[PDB]
Design an enzyme around this catalytic site. Structure first.
Site, PDB file in Angstrom:
ATOM      1  CG  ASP B 131      14.250 -12.228  44.792  1.00  0.00           C
ATOM      2  OD1 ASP B 131      14.634 -12.192  45.980  1.00  0.00           O
ATOM      3  OD2 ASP B 131      13.782 -13.262  44.265  1.00  0.00           O
ATOM      4  CE  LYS B 133      16.075 -15.695  45.685  1.00  0.00           C
ATOM      5  NZ  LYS B 133      14.941 -16.152  46.531  1.00  0.00           N
ATOM      6  CG  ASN B 136      16.768 -15.372  42.165  1.00  0.00           C
ATOM      7  OD1 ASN B 136      16.362 -16.513  42.372  1.00  0.00           O
ATOM      8  ND2 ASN B 136      16.051 -14.296  42.464  1.00  0.00           N
TER       9      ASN B 136
HETATM   10  N1  LIG Z   1      16.739 -20.868  33.266  1.00  0.00           N
HETATM   11  C1  LIG Z   1      17.203 -21.807  34.126  1.00  0.00           C
HETATM   12  N2  LIG Z   1      18.240 -22.619  33.840  1.00  0.00           N
HETATM   13  C2  LIG Z   1      18.590 -23.506  34.799  1.00  0.00           C
HETATM   14  N3  LIG Z   1      18.036 -23.690  36.016  1.00  0.00           N
HETATM   15  C3  LIG Z   1      17.005 -22.867  36.277  1.00  0.00           C
HETATM   16  C4  LIG Z   1      16.533 -21.900  35.375  1.00  0.00           C
HETATM   17  N4  LIG Z   1      15.466 -21.176  35.864  1.00  0.00           N
HETATM   18  C5  LIG Z   1      15.340 -21.744  37.050  1.00  0.00           C
HETATM   19  N5  LIG Z   1      16.228 -22.777  37.381  1.00  0.00           N
HETATM   20  C6  LIG Z   1      16.328 -23.590  38.637  1.00  0.00           C
HETATM   21  O1  LIG Z   1      15.040 -23.688  39.227  1.00  0.00           O
HETATM   22  C7  LIG Z   1      15.042 -23.026  40.479  1.00  0.00           C
HETATM   23  C8  LIG Z   1      13.689 -22.328  40.724  1.00  0.00           C
HETATM   24  O2  LIG Z   1      13.359 -21.406  39.683  1.00  0.00           O
HETATM   25  P1  LIG Z   1      12.964 -19.883  39.919  1.00  0.00           P
HETATM   26  O3  LIG Z   1      12.738 -19.187  38.615  1.00  0.00           O
HETATM   27  O4  LIG Z   1      14.147 -19.179  40.710  1.00  0.00           O
HETATM   28  O5  LIG Z   1      11.627 -19.848  40.781  1.00  0.00           O
HETATM   29  P2  LIG Z   1      10.884 -19.106  41.975  1.00  0.00           P
HETATM   30  O6  LIG Z   1       9.654 -19.833  42.412  1.00  0.00           O
HETATM   31  O7  LIG Z   1      10.534 -17.607  41.595  1.00  0.00           O
HETATM   32  N6  LIG Z   1      11.963 -19.100  43.338  1.00  0.00           N
HETATM   33  P3  LIG Z   1      12.298 -17.845  44.492  1.00  0.00           P
HETATM   34  O8  LIG Z   1      11.738 -16.482  43.911  1.00  0.00           O
HETATM   35  O9  LIG Z   1      13.782 -17.793  44.650  1.00  0.00           O
HETATM   36  O10 LIG Z   1      11.557 -18.220  45.845  1.00  0.00           O
HETATM   37  C9  LIG Z   1      16.250 -22.081  40.489  1.00  0.00           C
HETATM   38  O11 LIG Z   1      16.729 -21.905  41.808  1.00  0.00           O
HETATM   39  C10 LIG Z   1      17.259 -22.847  39.612  1.00  0.00           C
HETATM   40  O12 LIG Z   1      18.025 -23.773  40.366  1.00  0.00           O
HETATM   41 MN   LIG Z   2      10.841 -15.555  42.091  1.00  0.00          MN
HETATM   42 MN   LIG Z   3      14.480 -17.959  42.437  1.00  0.00          MN
END
Ligand SMILES: Nc1ncnc2c1ncn2[C@@H]1O[C@H](COP(=O)(O)OP(=O)(O)NP(=O)(O)O)[C@@H](O)[C@H]1O
Ligand SMILES: [Mn+2]
Ligand SMILES: [Mn+2]
Lengths: 10, 319
Positions: B131, B133, B136
């Protein structure tokens, strides 16, 4: 700028 | 050993499909982390248990300078929580949206650090990230790459071991995934291709806002580059974005090594990359630890049985 993307699984 | 009470919930960082990411301070030790909070109710109903479990193991079983480390992971009666290493610098997507384009040097620096991380996952953990991008890919307080979000990983992937699952982010999907035939660790290198195209050109290599037409271009359309772009960059991007994974840079047995050897990466010392000896071309200018400057303001302003089962062996603490 492009819009934010959303991840997925089937 | 860790419950909901133990942390100070300070500032919202994001809000994905399946849960929220909150900036937290640890009561016992004062250090700051980023918590991924997920409601079990959603997870079980929306059939997300498998991804949650793969993400938990992958963080736990990895230690790399460019992967966000997991401190604790704990469950409540109703919630699942990943206490993670906090990335002060925000997403690459944030900075690029504001700056349109990065210089080739800046792109090389992020590129190399992403290559170092993806090499580790492949060669040493037998994981495929799947994944990759701009979203991420985050920056730490110094401006080094941190790959977070491990929900879409595959484990137990060695040699030409292949996968079937249709997953990722539509804009970033490798042709072989879109063809719906088997694919291997090469999908990551396609993904590196796309993010590095974005960094150096200021757009996705293929775009339409309709997923089907989007996928039409990804499968059919010959790659095109800006006329500014240099020979070394163009060659790397061409190599990473070969539609047939067996012709792709990174697609062979030599995996990450093929891309490391590439003339675009000339003069990069790969051991020095892992050791962080290289000077980050951009320094995040965060004053305090709670400075959420580089996170979109839309987020960082808000106040704070069978549907809720137990998760065997979910709870984790580090050394
Ligand atoms: N460890 C971190 N430190 C800072 N910001 C974070 C961190 N983890 C996540 N974020 C923020 O939170 C957002 C969402 O978290 P994420 O783990 O990417 O979730 P998700 O539901 O799997 N999204 P996606 O798979 O891209 O549809 C990210 O795009 C970052 O902007
Ligand atoms: Mn995800
Ligand atoms: Mn994400």
């Amino acid at each position: 700028g492009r819009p934010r993307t959303t991840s997925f699984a089937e | 050993r860790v419950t909901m009470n133990e942390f100070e919930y300070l500032k919202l960082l994001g809000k994905g499909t399946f849960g929220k990411v909150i900036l937290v301070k640890e009561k016992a030790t004062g250090r700051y982390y980023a918590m991924k909070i997920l409601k079990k109710e959603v997870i079980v109903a929306k059939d997300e248990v498998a991804h949650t479990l793969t993400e938990n193991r992958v963080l736990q079983n990895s230690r790399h300078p460019f992967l966000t480390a997991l401190k604790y992971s704990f469950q409540t009666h109703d919630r699942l929580c990943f206490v993670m290493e906090y990335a002060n610098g925000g997403e690459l997507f944030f900075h690029l949206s504001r700056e349109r384009v990065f210089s080739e040097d800046r792109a090389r620096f992020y590129g190399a650090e992403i290559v170092s991380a993806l090499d580790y996952l492949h060669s040493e953990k037998n994981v495929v990230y799947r994944d990759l991008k701009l979203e991420n890919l985050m920056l730490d307080k110094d401006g080094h790459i941190k790959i977070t979000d491990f929900g879409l990983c595959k484990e137990g992937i060695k040699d030409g071991a292949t996968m079937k699952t249709f997953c990722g982010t539509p804009e970033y999907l490798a042709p072989e995934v879109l063809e719906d035939n088997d694919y291997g660790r090469a999908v990551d290198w396609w993904g590196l291709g796309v993010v590095m195209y974005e960094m150096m050109c200021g757009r996705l290599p293929f775009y339409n806002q309709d997923h089907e037409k989007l996928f039409e271009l990804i499968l059919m359309e010959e790659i095109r580059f800006p006329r500014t772009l240099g020979p070394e960059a163009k060659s790397l991007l061409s190599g990473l974005l070969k539609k047939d994974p067996k012709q792709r840079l990174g697609g062979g047995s030599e995996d990450a090594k093929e891309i490391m050897q590439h003339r675009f990466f000339a003069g990069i010392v790969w051991q020095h990359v892992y050791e962080k000896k290289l000077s980050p071309p951009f320094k995040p200018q965060v004053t305090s630890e709670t400075d959420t400057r580089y996170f979109d303001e839309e987020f960082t302003a808000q106040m704070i049985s069978e549907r809720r089962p137990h998760f065997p062996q979910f709870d984790y603490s580090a050394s």
